[PDB]
Every structure is written in structure tokens, then in C-alpha cells.
Design a protein around this ligand. Sequence first.
Ligand SMILES: [Zn+2]
Ligand SMILES: [Zn+2]
Lengths: 92, 41, 37, 279
Amino acid sequence: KDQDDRDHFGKKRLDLAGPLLAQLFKTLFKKLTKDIFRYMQRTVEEAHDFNMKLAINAKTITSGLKYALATGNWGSSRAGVSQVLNRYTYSS
Amino acid sequence: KPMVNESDGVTHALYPQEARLRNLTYSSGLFVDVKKRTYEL
Amino acid sequence: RITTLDETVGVTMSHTGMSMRSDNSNFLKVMPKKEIL
Amino acid sequence: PNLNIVLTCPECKVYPPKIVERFSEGDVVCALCGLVLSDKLVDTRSEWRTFNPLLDGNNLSTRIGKGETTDMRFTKELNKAQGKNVMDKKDNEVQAAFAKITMLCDAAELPKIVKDCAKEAYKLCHDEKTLKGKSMESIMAASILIGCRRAEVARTFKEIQSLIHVKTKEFGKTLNIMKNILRGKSQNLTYIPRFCSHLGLPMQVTTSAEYTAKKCKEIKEIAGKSPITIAVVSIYLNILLFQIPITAAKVGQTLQVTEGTIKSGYKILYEHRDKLVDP
Ligand SMILES: [Zn+2]
Ligand SMILES: [Zn+2]
């Protein structure tokens, strides 16, 4: 048998917004859970009252999605993913 | 659905035209049913 | 599929941040010297 | 000692420099005899292209993080060295205080202007003698409320109280002496659209409660008994004028107001119903 070809297009997989936002939302969700648990351990360890507004933050998901879809990086791993739409003509 | 929360505190529906004119971000809010339990074990 | 809440937003957005409603759920709330001698 | 360069025209010498600055040619010229005053003009926009004194001051610092090709042992030794020199300056409280205040403001969904005003207020107070404690919670809550009052925003005491348990009384004293600090370093209408947003009411009911709020502020009688009850009874009347039904229990449990208070204000308000009609 010949050496396995890597240029075969069938062995290649493309990634649209689905997989990218799956990785991104996955990591951001993990960080969210870790931070919430950190607030839980701080609450039970320092012996105080609990609050739902200080445990679950929204700027981690908002800053993660807004920052990743705002800049070219998808977090340098990946760059040049997001580009400004070219409105020179319709075929462009 | 897509929405916008302004500076004074009012949140209304967003359209892509007004999103482009006001330099906003066309996004939608996300909620989660968070369940809590306490075991004593 | 994911269910889209159809309300007037302002109610849910009011329940997000400060809504003047706290508590409502219990979770992570936690001499005479001779006689003494 | 002097060090002030003043450009004058030796040929004109008839008036202080009333000159013109030619940026395209890079010169500055007297607008009278047309004689140039200086060549090779520097720019401020061009040096700014590559790149906070209001809060950080003139202090400089640089981070040490891991490198492309480095060892994890050296990264820890450099960070532990900075951990021993962190006591040389008492500015660790400003970064941690601004971090927790950042978390609370980000939790309250307030704009960045109120965040910067609150950080500026906490920087004005910081560690003075008249503060004398308050366990860092009351100066943060009171600083957020001050930054809210400065940015023309409206947040009730029960809202920040719902965020932070400051025991109200000590919060009021710390807010009072803090206001004295601000005075030593030298409006209910905004609440209506917020509660109308909490109830999801149309714009006509919002501006109707605006005119009702102003008129009720002009009629006197009761005067206020805190503006919150005036707001909730004003919205209660403006919503009993139309047909959208909420009753008194739902609006009393949503806005956290007593039913007997909105009915007590609805009585005299119904008595003054005459002069409150806009159209
Ligand atoms: Zn001298
Ligand atoms: Zn001249």
C-alpha cells in the first residue's frame, strides 16, 4: 500500500461558527462554573451570607463572546478568523 | 430575542439597522435555570 | 429545542440585577475571685 | 527657573505673538510680516499612534509573565520576589478594592461612567481619618451610590442594600460623612422609567407618570414620605387610568411596596385627580 495521502479533501474537516462557538462557549462555561464554585468556597469558608448576584457573573460570557467575535483571535493559537465584511459590490 | 439595554436602564428590542447606526452589538440575552441543593451525608 | 422567553424583557431584566428582593431562599446562610478560684 | 520659550518676531516686535501655525509645511510664521518663526514642527498625533494618570498617578510598573522559551522555575522566582516587595507600597488596597467594586458594578449592570465615578469617589476618600473603618463594605456601597448620584442615575437604597448588607444605619452615617468629604474637596423623576421598565408599561404611561410626578410634586400635601411611594402611587394611578390590569398585590410584590401605602396614597391621589389630567 502507498503512503497515506494527506491532501485528500475528504480527510479534511471545515469549521464554521458552530464548532468555534462550541469550543469558545465550552471554555467560557467551564470558567464560569469554576468561578461560581470559587464564590461558594469563599462564602462557606469566610462564613457569610450568599447572594446570586455575586456568584454568577455575566461579564465572563459577555466579554468572552464579545471579545472573541470582536477581535481576530478566538481565545495566539488562532488569528484572522473574523474579518470586516467587504461591501465593494454584491459579488464581493 | 435580540435586545439592547441602554445607559439609563431601559431595555428594548434591537434591529440591525439601528444596531449599525448606534455602533451596538447585535446580541441576545442568555438565561439558565440554576438549581441549588444542600446535603447534610 | 431551546425555549425562547417571549415576555416584555423588562421583567426578566429586572430579575437579573438589583430587584429589591433578597433572601427568599436558605442556601449558604450560616465576679468574686475566691469563688472562681 | 524661567525655562519658558516665547516666540516673538524681531522685525515686528509690536505685539505679543499673534502668529499662525502651518502644520502641512511644518513651520510657525508671524501673520504680519510673513516671516517664519520656526521650522521643523513636531507632532503630537504621530507619537500618540503607538499608544491612566487620573487614577494611577505617575507610578510605573511592568508585568512579569512566562516567555516563549523559558522555564517555570524562573517565573515563580520572579513573582515571589515581587511578592516580597509588594509591601514597599500601600497601593494593593486600590487594585483589590477596584477589583471587587468592578465585580459589584459588573453584577449590577451599571454603565462604565458610574463605575469610573465610583472609582474616582473611592480614590478621593481612600484612607482618610474621618472614615475610621467601616470594614471596606460601606465605603464601597456608599461610593457606588455616590457615583450613581453624580452620573444622574437613580438607584434606591433597597437596591444597593439588596446587593450589599451594610445594615442601613452605618451605611447612612458613612454616606453622610462621605458626602462631607466630597463637600470638603471643593430628583425622583429618573425612577419612573425604571419602574415602568420593571412592569413593562408603554411610553404613554411613562410620560403620564412623569407629568403626574411633577404635578404631584407641585401640589404639596404629604410632600413625599420618601419619593419611592410617590412614584409607585403615581404609576398606580396612571395605570388605573387605562385598562392594563396589574392590581395592587402584583405591583406591591414586584416593586416591594406596601399595599396599604399605595392605597393610602391612592386615596389622596384620587382626591387630587382633578388637576393631573394631561390631555
Ligand atoms: Zn541666580
Ligand atoms: Zn512678524
